[PDB]
């Protein structure tokens, strides 16, 4: 057990600690950033470094009794692209057929010039392949309504229109900025004969997650836990909530009065909390986070909260730590391929280390590091690597709780009735499959100002329903 290396690792682990004080600071600061993000900004939305706090123009939570003919839904995530058909049967039930295809590496590389048409043509092709397989009879004649779930920040102008503010994650297609994604997708559908497919709704994967749970949640289960947040903890991270119309100052005052006159009280907000504190006024920052933001990410200066939490970057944090330990002549990389190989270590790699056992000489960690980049390790080295992984994930889980606590506090959602509890719809590989991530989230919520009495009233529920049901719900409401 090399003391020099052990002491260096323990020192790094301590930098990833998030104390109760920090959570209270970040929680309260988050609320401040929400109140400012809800003011009318007069500057380039694509360059605004504040909390976007984007109105989604969704004002009605599904009742669970919605029913209609089969709807279509397309979901472009951070890693995969999904097309599906959703049949809303009513009474919280639905029939779904979906096809999940991974996003070609061509779109995440810049060596070859990529354009919006390259992307939406491909999406149109996958849509045709889906309809041919699951709806071979009525592919060309039927009047399909499609809900488009676009997992990126969009300057929403209505339920069925909005321009891309800025790519995130691994996308850097330049010409898509400032263009209405619904039109770009509809044009490529028309250009392959699917003009009968009408994209009538545009939603974020957060908005879809919230609407999906309001429908699928049983009448009894929902009377207990009312869904108040729809959030994502996968390749990226984000969340939404219902905001009072009066507090949404970005909205046209006349439009606000119109909605109020129609009986509307709230509108869902796409917080884009991955961009929480982009200027790093209070977020923890290590030497490794700076490299990820400034060297290894596609969106330098933006989405810094995400780059400390989401699964796209957690693995890259460990890589930069090993490189730092090697630069200090403390860790031998052997014949590995970590150098000049960003993102070779993925969050999936870390999941095999999070709960590996010494009883097996940390063999799961061994195979995971060899499979990822041929990094040979000793037992004492794996013991220390596990400490780093558990430090990275714990910080991600603790920071993940801050936006949830802030929203619940600002909206006074946890104390509204006797025996009142709230549900937070969670989707994503990390929250769903990373061992202990949800457990540690609840730990941070217990340390946040809502306290353990608040954590016990919050249900972080895995929403496997999906944004497709939510997108289908928006399509069912819209006109063809």
Ligand X SMILES: OC[C@H]1O[C@@H](O)[C@H](O)[C@@H](O)[C@@H]1O
Question: For binding to ligand X (CB under 6 A), which residues are involved?
Answer: 77-78, 151-153, 168-169, 204-206, 232, 234-238, 272, 274, 303, 306
417 binds a copy of itself (CB under 8 A): yes
Region from 237-245, 263-271, 406-414, 432-440 binding a copy of itself, contact rule CB under 8 A: 432-440
Q: What is the DSSP string of 199-213?
A: EEEEE-HHHHHHHHH
Provide, for the chain, the percentages of residues in helix, strand and coil under a 3-state DSSP scheme, each rounded to the nearest 5.
Answer: 45, 20, 35
Q: Provide the annotated binding site for ATP.
A: 100, 465-470
Structure tokens at 434: 């990373």
455 near a copy of itself (CB under 8 A): yes
DSSP 69: S
Does residue 465 contact residue 203 with C-beta atoms inside 8 Å?
no
Chosen from a copy of itself, ligand X, none, partner binding at 217 (C-beta under 5 to 8 Å by type): none
Single out the segment in contact with a copy of itself by CB under 8 A; choices: 131-139, 210-218, 368-376, 447-455.
Answer: 447-455
Indicate which residues carry an active-site annotation: 151, 166, 205
Partner from a copy of itself, ligand X, none contacting 218, C-beta within 5 to 8 A by type: none
Residue 52 half-sphere exposure, CB side, CA atoms within 13 Å? 28
Closest contact distance (angstroms) between CB of 324 and ligand X is: 26
Q: Is the dihedral of CA 185, 187, 192, 196 positive or negative?
A: positive
Of 347-366, binders to a copy of itself (CB under 8 A) are 354-355, 357
Using the rule CB under 8 A, which residue among 42, 102, 262, 418 binds a copy of itself?
A: 418
Measured over the CA atoms of residue 26, residue 27, residue 28 and residue 30, the dihedral's sign is positive
342 vs 435, which CB is nearer to a copy of itself?
435
CB of 305 to ligand X, least distance (A): 10
> Which residues, listed in sequence order, are joined to residue 94 by a DSSP beta bridge?
88
Tell me which of 436, 449, 461, 477 binds a copy of itself, using CB under 8 A.
436
Q: Which of 64, 68, 342, 435 binds a copy of itself (CB under 8 A)?
A: 435
Which residue lies nearer to a copy of itself by CB, 73 or 441?
441
CB–CB of 316/347 below 8 Å? no
Residue 205 binding result from ligand X, a copy of itself, none, given CB thresholds of 5 to 8 Å by partner type: ligand X
Q: Quickly list H helices, 267-346.
A: 287-291, 311-327
- Terminal Cα-to-Cα distance of the chain (whole angstroms): 68
């Amino acid at each position: 057990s090399d003391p020099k290396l052990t002491k260096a690792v323990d020192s790094i682990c301590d930098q990833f600690i998030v104390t109760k004080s920090k959570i209270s600071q970040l929680t309260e600061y988050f609320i401040d950033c929400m109140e400012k993000g809800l003011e009318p900004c007069e500057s380039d939305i694509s360059q605004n470094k504040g909390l976007p706090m984007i109105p989604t123009f969704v004002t009605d939570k599904p009742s669970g009794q919605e029913h209609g003919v089969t709807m279509l839904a397309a979901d472009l995530g951070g890693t995969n692209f999904r097309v599906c058909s959703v049949e809303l049967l009513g009474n919280h039930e639905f029939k779904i057929e979906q096809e999940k295809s991974k996003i070609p590496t061509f779109f995440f590389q810049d060596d070859h010039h990529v354009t919006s048409k390259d992307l939406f043509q491909h999406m149109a092709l996958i849509t045709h392949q889906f309809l041919t397989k699951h709806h071979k009879d009525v592919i060309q004649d039927y009047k399909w309504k499609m809900g488009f779930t676009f997992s990126y920040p969009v300057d929403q102008t209505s339920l069925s229109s909005g321009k891309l503010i800025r790519w995130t994650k691994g996308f850097k297609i330049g010409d898509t900025v400032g263009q209405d994604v619904v039109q770009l997708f509809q044009q490529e559908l028309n250009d392959i004969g699917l003009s009968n497919v009408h994209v009538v709704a545009l939603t974020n994967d957060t908005t879809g997650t919230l609407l999906a749970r309001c429908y699928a949640s049983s009448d009894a289960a929902r009377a207990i836990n009312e869904p108040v947040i729809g959030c994502i903890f996968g390749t990226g991270t984000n969340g939404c909530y219902m905001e009072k119309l009066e507090n949404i100052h970005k909205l046209d005052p006349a439009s606000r009065e119109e909605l109020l006159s129609q009986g509307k009280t709230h509108m869902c907000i796409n917080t884009e909390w991955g961009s929480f504190d982009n200027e790093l006024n209070h977020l923890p920052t290590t030497s490794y986070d700076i490299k990820i933001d400034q060297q290894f990410s596609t969106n330098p200066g933006f989405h810094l909260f995400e780059k400390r939490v989401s699964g796209l970057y957690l693995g890259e944090i460990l890589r930069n730590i090993l490189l730092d330990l090697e630069k200090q002549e403390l860790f031998d990389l052997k014949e590995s391929v970590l150098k000049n190989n960003p993102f070779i270590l993925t969050t999936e790699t870390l999941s095999h280390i999070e709960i590996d056992t010494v009883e097996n000489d940390l063999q799961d960690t061994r195979d995971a590091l060899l499979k990822a980049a041929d990094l040979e390790t000793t037992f004492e080295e794996r013991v220390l690597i596990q400490k780093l992984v558990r430090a990275i994930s714990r910080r991600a889980a603790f920071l993940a709780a801050v936006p949830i606590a802030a929203i619940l506090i600002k909206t006074n959602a946890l104390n509204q009735s006797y025996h009142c509890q709230v549900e937070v719809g969670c989707d994503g590989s990390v929250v769903e499959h990373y061992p202990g991530f949800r457990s540690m989230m609840r730990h941070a919520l217990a340390l946040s100002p809502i306290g353990p009495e608040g954590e016990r009233d919050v249900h972080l529920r895995i929403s496997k329903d999906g944004s497709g049901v939510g997108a289908a719900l928006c399509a069912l409401h819209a006109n063809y």
